[PDB]
Amino acid sequence: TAGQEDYDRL
Amino acid sequence: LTPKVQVYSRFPASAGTKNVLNCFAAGFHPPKISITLMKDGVPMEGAQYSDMSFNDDWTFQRLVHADFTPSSGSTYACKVEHETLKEPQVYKWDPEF
Amino acid sequence: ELHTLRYIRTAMTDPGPGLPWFVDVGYVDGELFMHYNSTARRAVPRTEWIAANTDQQYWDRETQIVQGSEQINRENLDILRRRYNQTGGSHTVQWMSGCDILEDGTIRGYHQAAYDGRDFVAFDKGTMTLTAAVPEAVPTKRKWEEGGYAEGLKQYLEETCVEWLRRYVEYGKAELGRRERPEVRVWGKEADGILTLSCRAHGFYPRPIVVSWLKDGAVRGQDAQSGGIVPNGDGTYHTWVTIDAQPGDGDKYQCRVEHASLPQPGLYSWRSGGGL
């Protein structure tokens, strides 16, 4: 149960 | 970050009975690894490569398994090729150990 | 009562031959439930308790957000490469995501990242800031405080992560609660005046196991060398514990296996022999 793929942004 | 390999069977070894041969390697980097199961020095058919996963200390782990039938006189082993190893590590499987 | 969820993500440069570059694997209390591949581009269920309790629109929503991470981590593989002034070779981007439900009922959310097997950035919930480990992780922190990332993650880890984890325990109550009995076999070998005794346990669930050797009904801790709890292809586990002894002293040595499936610890000998 994952969310915003934006939190992977480095 | 040198790979630690361990060769083992799913069910207790029996002659003329279906069994799954497993080769587990953990604690290695880079994640690129060549794990192959072999019968008498020749690779085995039906290898299941699944899957790229890391531990809490960012160290990778991989499980390779294939369905086989143990036979007397034939030797079963696992070959692991890595850039850190230099020489390929071979772990022999024993039905009575 | 301790429940855990982990989202393992790996972005690779050298997979290498005929292997995927991006993989996303999900876990519930150690057991695998979801899997993603770079060539397949679809998030699929592994166990039966998750597939029978979820809709197809749920999995279509999950694969859409995971393929979004695939493109984002592909950029990070190039952005970080220029930060360290590298051309390309063997570089990997690792991602840790999920939350823990303690026995008392305390939330424990975590969001960690790593580059080339070394920690890059970790999220702090008690400070509401992103912790930088390497001086190259400073521009990452700057991007996070420029927009909205810290507020959204707290609303996700403390609520969204926990709300669904509570449902997974209810869905897989029969699967995770089930206990499997291992098949114990006691072996031996002779080399150069040393009688090496082996103890192998085949297919047990759950993962925690206590395997120890006993000489004359006494625990010999120091002496026995263990291989570790290694997993099988069908989800179950295996362990290998070995000890060195004198030749002609095999019968006085016995393997003790402590498991959740057994009401009392099982004592196994070579001549007994093993099971049952």
Side-chain angles (χ1 to χ4, degrees):
Chain A
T1 16
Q4 237 120 312
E5 63 264 31
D6 293 322
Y7 303 141
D8 283 54
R9 292 185 185 270
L10 241 52
Chain B
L1 294 143
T2 318
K4 291 147 271 134
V5 214
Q6 200 187 299
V7 65
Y8 56 102
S9 58
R10 167 67 186 88
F11 297 104
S14 300
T17 316
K18 194 200 82 73
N19 211 322
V20 186
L21 202 70
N22 314 273
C23 192
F24 192 82
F28 59 91
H29 189 266
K32 197 186 96 174
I33 197 147
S34 186
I35 306 156
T36 314
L37 276 309
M38 47 175 68
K39 177 178 183 285
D40 297 288
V42 186
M44 286 148 73
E45 197 198 39
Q48 289 153 281
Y49 310 96
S50 186
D51 215 293
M52 267 291 118
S53 187
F54 55 84
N55 210 65
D56 209 277
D57 56 296
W58 313 106
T59 49
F60 298 96
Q61 59 172 260
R62 189 160 248 182
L63 177 75
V64 182
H65 60 279
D67 297 75
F68 88 111
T69 312
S71 184
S72 297
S74 60
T75 50
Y76 303 97
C78 186
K79 195 194 247 282
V80 169
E81 286 165 275
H82 206 95
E83 57 188 86
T84 318
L85 283 171
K86 184 191 168 184
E87 254 263 72
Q89 274 196 305
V90 189
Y91 285 86
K92 198 205 259 178
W93 176 82
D94 197 80
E96 285 161 48
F97 203 81
Chain C
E1 215 139 289
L2 202 133
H3 307 114
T4 188
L5 188 100
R6 272 162 72 140
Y7 268 89
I8 282 96
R9 301 181 197 95
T10 307
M12 289 168 277
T13 307
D14 230 309
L19 285 149
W21 62 276
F22 190 87
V23 284
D24 200 325
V25 188
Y27 296 97
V28 171
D29 290 65
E31 199 183 76
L32 218 149
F33 85 107
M34 104 99 188
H35 178 262
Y36 183 85
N37 215 266
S38 83
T39 190
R41 295 186 98 263
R42 190 79 74 180
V44 287
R46 195 112 284 165
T47 51
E48 279 177 46
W49 59 266
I50 191 82
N53 282 281
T54 59
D55 299 59
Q56 236 294 99
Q57 47 263 35
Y58 160 81
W59 292 105
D60 288 337
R61 183 168 274 269
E62 290 300 302
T63 191
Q64 210 207 312
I65 59 110
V66 168
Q67 73 194 356
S69 304
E70 185 195 64
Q71 190 72 266
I72 278 155
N73 287 295
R74 195 208 196 103
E75 293 176 296
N76 301 326
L77 202 82
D78 302 309
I79 288 152
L80 261 68
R81 205 135 68 184
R82 282 181 279 268
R83 285 186 190 178
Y84 283 89
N85 284 114
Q86 295 162 319
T87 182
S90 299
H91 308 286
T92 187
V93 177
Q94 289 152 279
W95 273 97
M96 187 113 278
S97 297
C99 60
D100 301 323
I101 302 160
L102 270 89
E103 292 186 289
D104 43 36
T106 311
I107 49 99
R108 204 145 284 182
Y110 46 89
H111 203 70
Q112 289 153 65
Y115 181 74
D116 286 56
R118 293 174 203 93
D119 228 288
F120 195 79
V121 279
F123 189 79
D124 229 279
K125 282 161 93 279
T127 331
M128 294 180 189
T129 52
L130 185 79
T131 318
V134 206
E136 284 92 324
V138 184
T140 303
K141 194 199 161 78
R142 296 279 175 269
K143 284 178 179 180
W144 276 53
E145 57 207 321
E146 198 175 358
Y149 292 92
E151 321 89 44
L153 257 169
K154 195 167 243 76
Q155 297 287 290
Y156 158 76
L157 292 161
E158 300 185 333
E159 290 171 282
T160 315
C161 180
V162 189
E163 270 161 60
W164 280 96
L165 220 171
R166 275 192 146 96
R167 284 196 280 264
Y168 303 148
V169 180
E170 204 77 86
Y171 298 157
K173 202 181 179 286
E175 191 87 291
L176 296 154
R178 201 161 64 91
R179 283 155 185 173
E180 183 58 48
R181 271 136 68 175
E183 285 180 82
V184 188
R185 299 283 179 270
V186 182
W187 305 110
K189 255 210 275 176
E190 189 71 56
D192 297 87
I194 306 133
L195 189 84
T196 313
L197 250 76
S198 182
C199 194
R200 295 257 192 190
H202 297 259
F204 52 89
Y205 197 88
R207 196 184 151 90
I209 198 159
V210 181
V211 184
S212 58
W213 277 105
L214 261 82
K215 165 71 160 74
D216 281 65
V219 191
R220 294 254 279 185
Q222 218 319 93
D223 315 77
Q225 197 187 284
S226 186
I229 311 147
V230 281
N232 291 293
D234 66 289
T236 193
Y237 300 94
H238 182 89
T239 188
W240 174 51
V241 177
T242 184
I243 199 158
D244 293 288
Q246 280 284 296
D249 290 72
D251 290 70
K252 56 231 275 181
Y253 270 92
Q254 62 200 101
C255 188
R256 189 170 165 253
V257 181
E258 290 168 78
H259 202 255
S261 61
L262 283 313
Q264 275 170 256
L267 293 143
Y268 312 98
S269 299
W270 192 3
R271 206 168 286 275
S272 278
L276 213 134

